[PDB]
């Protein structure tokens, strides 16, 4: 008639509901109240029919599509929820801590069972026992472990040993329970290994092949967030499905592995999609144990309960006891081999992860399939009472005494600069409120408003709210402005000041970091690596962040570069040659070559059965493709060379004529001739796959290596910007001069070492790096672009619909680039010269520099520019690093800087000296065709402005950032500002200038100035004081005055 299950399961959503609200202070967890109330239902059911009707139809389910509904959900959220770069960080531990844990305590577990239990078990129904009661399911240690501050690895390793705890748990369950409940098979050795290997490896092989054809599917949808959500799920469902009943494979490891890399890949996927996707399984694998609990608690109480004796809960604490004890044994014992990891576990961390085993909703269900296949023998029961037992006792006691023993152990505390953070961010909220409500209170509209209910209502306080000791030697340790006493410094005050200063240095450092990541600058997994080093050198005595513990971020070294290598040096190769030209014909002897193999396989298929004779054997396997098309019309009648030297040739040779051996058995026409037929298909179908499946195995470890490059890229880019700003900081922080100038020295050579390895860097893997860098420049474009569609959103000058038709437009984009090609080739120099800042616009004065240039080659150790020698031209770098020394400043230039502006234009001699790092490949403009060029052209932007104007951005940008290093502006909002601006023309303003309101900033470049009415005349080129009205400018033959401002936005 109408569905009882729909009730049943309203029912435990809205008890489930009424569970999680009303035990939100209580440390009892809602699950033990919702097997309290599953089991009221279920004696209330076995009082009132109506009750039983719908609790027979729901909780007396059939244990197969109980696994098939409830267990892809809980595995696949298991695996979802993770982080996986720290569990993949240290996933060496956690597999062998979960798998030989499990192993161990299954065997210890089965044989306590057999030499305790009163019943006449056998090994086999003890280790299925064993396997139910060594699933792990925590969440509220997890939950607990993240919100309370450190040892957030401990969590990690927790869930992850919970998810392979759970996944190989039911792999031996579903072994032993086809031993025991089925034992109608009798099975040698060989078939026996051949079972153990196609579940272990059969598993991950068929999740590693869903889940990259799904992370294929997910990285080809745009715009479309629904389809996205249903392929998520369908592949979870189907591939569990697939797996244990149509491959006969372990589908909790194929979820475990699906899980893992949908996890691990989540770039594919839009980030609303991304985070729907999160909230979706966390409330799907709610619903799925809200619902196990409930049906767990009314078989309990309906069929469980009624063969129960005392020696049955005299049995369940004894083996509640002896479980715990059987873990603490497991993880003391493996605690060497787990603490010769680059993760060690110390005593603390084994206690609370022995303690944190909370036995949760898998082994349940485990228990209910236990239950349902023994039918009406008691073997069930006692499965079913001594797991509900095993939960029950295990969410209790281990929940409360996991939150005392996080405050006894000294793992609850809140450390002293989380603790100095939180509580500045308390009272700058509380300033902020404070400056509101003064607003608030002299404002039309809200004046009568009453302010007691505001200030009850508006109050944020700080969560937090030998110690002592530290805490009273760290506030001793600051010669700041809160105290004025003139001294001088002592060596242990000397002591004391270098390591606050190296304190405070690593501590800028980190918000550096957190700073580009909040601007979309620095990727995650890079500021995660970046913030560890950083509180790694904070821990140490005297370590800064050092440059070794860099650069194994990027290493490039190891598997995928000597792939690489190897598959380039296979596939390097070296009339009728046009239409082996057009490569056209490649293509269709490749779907030739797959038209041949499928068909030919069944003619296998039908040999190894072995109608109209095979199809007169398929007409000669249709006269075996023509013979392979007549050879490719005799390989397209023997082109010469091109078919003598290829090796690949050679073996279509050996191909065509072991067709020609097919040709005359067909003439003979038997034993011999199907096991040679056999050899020809074989050699033909893997040969002539292999020339396809090479360069699709080169974008793969071009993948891999380009993700890799990208992660060292990001490392050093943040660890530079960083450097750059802390350098630009520093002389606040530190008061002393000589503390301050063996900082600077430490900053500014490991700022050159890691600009040196970069460079060397792009050397090594030219398209890769070239990839990554376009990637990461359309990325900052696109990005900017959205900043400007949100500020023309907020700004009330485009309304919300066509605003949100734009971001779905950058959006598509932004997941397009995802989608990139993984090495794109690196340009020619032409292409590097079209590119160039201060030649883009013009096409005619492209074609003047094309025709004024020379490539100009230099070794190692060369000298490119010297510093006496006066200025005969421009240098533009279009591949090679180049060093700088001058007169003292440091820095390594890239590939598209141009080397000589200033030298070309004001004319006097160079500033530094340019030797090569690596060999360089520079274009050599004589400074007579740079003049002649400067000359010829008169446009609005003219060589003139241009090259002024790229010069003016350089010497502009560090004062800039000199000034505004207090306001915190990064240097890409510093040159973004900057290049708002134009260089002014005096001739047009007669050579007086007037400062405006308007005007955000004055920089003079070159050249000497008179201010404030020859108050004082200003020699340094340097920003103009805002204290200065206006600047009067006078000609001085090749001075040439240039001054760069910019002006404020006007909406
Ligand atoms: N502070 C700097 N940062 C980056 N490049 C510089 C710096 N100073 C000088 N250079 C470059 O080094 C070149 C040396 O010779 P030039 O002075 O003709 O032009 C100079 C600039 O291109």
């Known amino acids: ?303 469980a309960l009624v063969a129960v004796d005392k020696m049955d809960w005299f049995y369940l604490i004894i083996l509640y006891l002896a479980i715990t004890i059987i873990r603490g044994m497991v993880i003391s014992l493996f605690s060497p081999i787990l603490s010769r990891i680059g993760y060690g576990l110390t005593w603390r961390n084994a206690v609370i992860m022995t303690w944190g085993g909370l036995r949760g909703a898998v082994g349940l269900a485990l228990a209910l399939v236990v239950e349902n296949l023994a039918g009406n023998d008691v073997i069930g029961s006692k499965f079913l009472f001594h797991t509900a037992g095993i939960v029950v006792l295990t969410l209790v006691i281990n929940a409360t005494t996991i939150q005392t023993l996080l405050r006894i152990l000294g793992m609850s505390d809140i450390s002293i600069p989380k603790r100095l953070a939180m509580a500045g961010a308390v009272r700058r909220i509380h300033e902020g409120q404070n400056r509101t409500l003064n607003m608030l209170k002299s404002d039309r509209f809200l004046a009568d408003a009453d302010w007691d209910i505001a200030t009850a209502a508006c109050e944020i306080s700080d969560p937090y709210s030998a110690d002592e000791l530290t805490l009273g030697e760290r506030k001793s340790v600051c010669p700041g402005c809160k105290a004025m006493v003139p001294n001088e410094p002592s060596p242990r005050e000397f002591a004391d000041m270098m390591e606050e200063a190296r304190l405070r240095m690593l501590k800028a450092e980190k918000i550096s970091y957190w700073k580009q990541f909040e601007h979309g600058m620095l990727a995650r997994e890079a500021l995660r690596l970046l913030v560890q080093h950083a509180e790694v050198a904070a821990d140490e005595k005297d370590q800064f962040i050092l440059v070794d513990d860099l650069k194994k971020s990027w290493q490039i070294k190891g598997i995928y570069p000597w792939l690489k290598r190897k598959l380039e040096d296979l596939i390097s190769e070296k009339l009728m040659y046009k239409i082996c030209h057009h490569m056209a014909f490649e293509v269709t002897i490749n779907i030739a070559i797959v038209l041949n193999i499928v068909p030919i396989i069944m003619e296998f298929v039908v040999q190894d059965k072995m109608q109209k004779i095979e199809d007169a054997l398929r007409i000669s396997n249709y006269v075996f493709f023509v013979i392979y098309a007549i050879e490719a019309i005799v390989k397209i009648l023997g082109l010469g060379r091109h078919y003598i030297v290829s090796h690949w040739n050679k073996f279509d040779a050996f191909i065509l004529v072991v067709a020609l051996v097919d040709i005359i058995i067909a003439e003979t026409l038997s034993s011999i001739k199907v096991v040679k037929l056999f050899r020809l298909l074989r050699g033909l179908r893997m040969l002539r796959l292999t020339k396809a499946l090479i360069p699709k195995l080169i974008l793969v470890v071009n993948g891999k290596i380009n993700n890799q490059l990208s992660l060292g890229y990001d490392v050093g880019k943040g660890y530079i910007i960083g450097e750059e700003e802390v350098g630009k900081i520093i002389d606040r922080m530190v008061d002393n001069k000589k503390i301050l100038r063996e900082l600077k020295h430490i900053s500014e050579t490991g700022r050159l070492q890691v600009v040196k390895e970069l460079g060397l860097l792009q050397r090594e893997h030219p398209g890769i790096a070239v990839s990554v860098k376009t990637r990461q420049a359309i990325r900052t474009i696109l990005n900017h672009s959205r900043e400007t569609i949100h500020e023309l959103q907020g700004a009330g000058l485009l309304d919300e619909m066509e605003a949100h038709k734009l971001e779905l437009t950058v959006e598509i984009k932004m997941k397009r680039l995802m989608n990139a090609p993984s090495s794109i080739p690196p340009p020619p120099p032409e292409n590097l010269l079209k590119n160039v800042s201060w030649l883009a616009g013009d096409m005619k004065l492209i074609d003047f520099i094309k025709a004024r240039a020379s490539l100009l080659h230099f070794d190692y150790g060369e000298v490119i520019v010297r510093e006496g020698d006066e200025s005969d031209g421009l240098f533009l770098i279009v591949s090679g690093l180049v060093k700088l020394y001058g007169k003292v400043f440091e820095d390594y230039l890239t590939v598209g800087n141009v080397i000589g502006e200033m030298g070309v234009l004001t004319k006097k001699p160079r500033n530094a000296t340019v030797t090569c790092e690596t060999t360089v490949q520079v274009y050599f403009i004589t400074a007579e065709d740079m003049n002649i060029a400067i000359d010829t052209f008169t446009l609005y932007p003219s060589l003139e402005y241009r090259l002024w104007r790229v010069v003016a951005i350089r010497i502009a940008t560090p004062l800039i950032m000199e000034q505004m290093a207090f306001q915190g502006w990064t240097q890409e909002k510093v040159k973004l500002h900057l290049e708002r601006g134009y260089l002014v023309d005096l001739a047009e303003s007669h050579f007086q200038f007037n400062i405006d309101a308007t005007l955000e900033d004055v920089i003079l470049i070159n050249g000497t100035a008179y201010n404030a009415h020859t108050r004082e005349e200003i020699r340094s080129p340097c920003l103009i004081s805002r204290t200065v009205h206006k600047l009067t400018f006078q000609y001085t033959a090749t001075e040439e005055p240039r001054l760069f401002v910019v002006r404020n936005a006007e909406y």
């Open 1 to 303: 008639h109408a569905p009882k299950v729909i009730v049943f399961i309203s029912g435990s959503c809205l008890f489930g509901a009424i569970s999680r609200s009303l035990f939100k202070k209580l440390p009892i967890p809602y699950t033990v109240v919702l097997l309290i109330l599953g089991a009221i239902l279920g004696v209330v059911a076995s009082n009132v029919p109506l009750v039983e009707e719908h609790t027979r139809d729901v909780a007396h389910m059939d244990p197969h599509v109980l696994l098939q509904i409830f267990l892809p959900v809980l595995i696949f959220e298991s695996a979802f929820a993770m982080d996986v770069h720290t569990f993949m960080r240290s996933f060496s531990q956690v597999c062998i801590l979960a798998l030989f844990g499990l192993v161990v305590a299954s065997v210890l577990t089965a044989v306590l069972a057999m030499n305790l239990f009163n019943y006449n078990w056998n090994f086999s129904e003890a280790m299925m026992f064993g396997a139910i009661m060594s699933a792990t399911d925590p969440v509220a240690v997890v939950a607990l472990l993240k919100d309370l501050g450190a040892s957030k690895q401990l969590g990690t390793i927790i869930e992850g040993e919970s998810l392979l705890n759970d996944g190989c748990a039911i792999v031996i369950f579903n072994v032993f329970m086809k031993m025991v409940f089925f034992p109608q098979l009798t099975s040698t050795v060989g078939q026996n290994v051949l079972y153990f290997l196609q579940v272990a490896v059969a598993g991950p092989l068929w999740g590693y092949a869903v889940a990259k054809v799904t992370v294929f599917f997910l990285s080809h949808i745009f715009n479309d967030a629904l389809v996205e959500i249903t392929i998520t799920l369908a592949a979870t469902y189907l591939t569990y499905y697939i797996g244990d009943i149509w491959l006969e494979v372990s589908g909790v490891l194929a979820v475990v592995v699906l899980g893992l890399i949908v996890n691990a890949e989540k770039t594919s996927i839009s980030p609303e999609v991304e985070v729907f996707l999160h909230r979706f399984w966390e409330m799907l694998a709610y619903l799925a144990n809200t619902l196990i609990f409930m049906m767990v608690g009314v078989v309990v109480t309906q069929k």
